[PDB]
């Protein structure tokens, strides 16, 4: 796949219509806390409460990825692999 790392920073993308928004019940501050599919690493979260919503009109928002308010556990972004 292709790669674009926001090393430094926050990932803070927009998602995109049909996109999953992932949030974790462990790792997340709380429920508005969710990561994109760019960021979101499965081994951070194997044993995790993971759940999925999906981009539209009245669902929205921004990757929250290198937030460190939104997040309990280092999150080990996605990207950052090689
Ligand atoms: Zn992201
Ligand atoms: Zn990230
Ligand atoms: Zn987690």
Do not use: M
Request: hydrophobic share 20%.
């Amino acid at each position: 796949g292709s790669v674009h790392k926001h090393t430094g920073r926050n990932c803070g993308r927009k998602f995109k219509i049909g996109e999953p928004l992932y949030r974790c019940h462990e790792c997340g501050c709380d429920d508005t806390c969710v990561l994109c599919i760019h960021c979101f690493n499965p081994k951070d979260h194997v044993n995790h409460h993971v759940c999925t919503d999906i981009c539209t009109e009245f669902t929205s928002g921004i990757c929250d990825c290198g937030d460190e308010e939104a997040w309990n556990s280092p999150l080990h972004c996605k990207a950052e692999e090689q």
